[PDB]
Amino acid sequence: MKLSARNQLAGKVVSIKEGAVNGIVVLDIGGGNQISSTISMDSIRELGLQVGSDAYAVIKATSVMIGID
Amino acid sequence: MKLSARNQLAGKVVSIKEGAVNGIVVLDIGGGNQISSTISMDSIRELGLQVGSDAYAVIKATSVMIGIDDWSHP
Amino acid sequence: MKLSARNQLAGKVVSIKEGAVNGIVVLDIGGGNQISSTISMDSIRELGLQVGSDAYAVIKATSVMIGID
Amino acid sequence: MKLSARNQLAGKVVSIKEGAVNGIVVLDIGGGNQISSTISMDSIRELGLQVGSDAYAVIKATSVMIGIDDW
Amino acid sequence: MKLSARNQLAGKVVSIKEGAVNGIVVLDIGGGNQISSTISMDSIRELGLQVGSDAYAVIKATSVMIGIDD
Amino acid sequence: MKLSARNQLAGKVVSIKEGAVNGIVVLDIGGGNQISSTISMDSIRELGLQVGSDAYAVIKATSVMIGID
Ligand code: MOO
Ligand code: MOO
Ligand code: MOO
Ligand code: MOO
Ligand code: MOO
Ligand code: MOO
Ligand code: MOO
Ligand code: MOO
């Protein structure tokens, strides 16, 4: 699928924290940046995610806030 | 403030699209990545954002989905 | 791309209301259900959406609330 | 109450997966479509949800993305 | 309707900023606190919201972050 | 940090329910209102949150719906 989400950032899974119905996937997206994703355990399984998997961090633009110092 | 949001990514503003009540801020966060943020025009003004401003893309972890390529067969 | 979002509902575009930076797409997913999506104008154009387009309403499970009468 | 959320889709609970502080509710909304919802366990209990309950999937329009087959 | 959203804060509309497809509704919830809501113009119209209307700010718990003084 | 989020509501923590990857923090913001926040256990710990902590409920304007009677 091609998705409307403005942010689709390629990266590699560096850690997966398994929970009860959700888990937290951490992706190394390059440039010294990592992104954490809290998604359902069902999806972690269905997408076959493991540490070292290639994946994408997908974020709708309306979910992104801006901060400054 | 220190914020719970797991994702707080430093970057530089490369473009701002001004709308009616919202606008879209594009941040270059390095490594060839850009992040687009759709936020209120009021916030854009109050934060003094301009092209070239240093800022952060702030994303709650529950807002981030994971994708894989179409030819991966889990 | 294949996505973690638990909800990926096939439907046809029945209307697009254009805004300044966002627009609102209405998708008929069948059975008398329609879904409204508020997304960037950039995305509406990039996906080539028009009345009658085949598409999907994509919703993260953590964005779905449950209501009762 | 009546809510601004543009999407309020009637359906029946087909499953509830209990987690620690959240659970996942699946609703059959008709037309062969199901909606999965990740909400607090407290809300699952407070709303009296069980398999067979009548309910609604409620989604804010700004939470909905559009995808296409990009063949 | 009764909703799973854990946050439902009563207040009065103090302002509505109309946009193109969205508008921004501000509610006075008391205590010198206001909540701003960015929602569709269609909903603002359908709910009959005007300055002075009694309403509620409704927020899913997964949408709320916590911040602290550093 | 200063944040674009239009809603930044001061309050005191009155409850913490710990989960597997998430927890739920309840903040009393005054006027008889409490705001519940479902966030990662990691952040709950990193922010040092306990019953009695002073904190803020932070909500993006696009996450706030309006309801009426
Ligand atoms: O155009 Mo989006 O789907 O709001 O990022
Ligand atoms: O721990 Mo968060 O605020 O869900 O990213
Ligand atoms: O939270 Mo999900 O598993 O991306 O719908
Ligand atoms: O295009 Mo808007 O109405 O400023 O979100
Ligand atoms: O008008 Mo809404 O509450 O953004 O779906
Ligand atoms: O109940 Mo959890 O901590 O969201 O899996
Ligand atoms: O996640 Mo909730 O339990 O709908 O606020
Ligand atoms: O959409 Mo905002 O201006 O980050 O609350």
Numbering used by the authors:
A (entry chain B), C (entry chain C), F (entry chain D): 1 to 69
B (entry chain A): 1 to 74
D (entry chain E): 1 to 71
E (entry chain F): 1 to 70
Reproduce passages from the article.
Crystal structures revealed Tub assembles as a hexamer composed of a trimer of dimers, capable of binding eight tungstate oxyanions at two distinct binding sites located at inter-subunit interfaces. Tub enables E. limosum to accumulate W and then supplies W for two tungstoenzymes needed for conversion of lactate to SCFAs.
A native-gel shift assay of rTub showed that it also bound molybdate and retained its oligomeric nature. Tub demonstrates comparable binding behavior for both tungstate and molybdate in vitro. Similarly, Mo-loaded Tub exhibited the same thermal stability as the W-loaded form and was also resistant to trypsin digestion. While it also binds molybdate in vitro, E. limosum cells preferentially take up W rather than Mo, and its physiological role appears to be to bind tungstate. Whether or not a TOBE protein binds molybdate or tungstate cannot be determined by sequence or structural information alone.
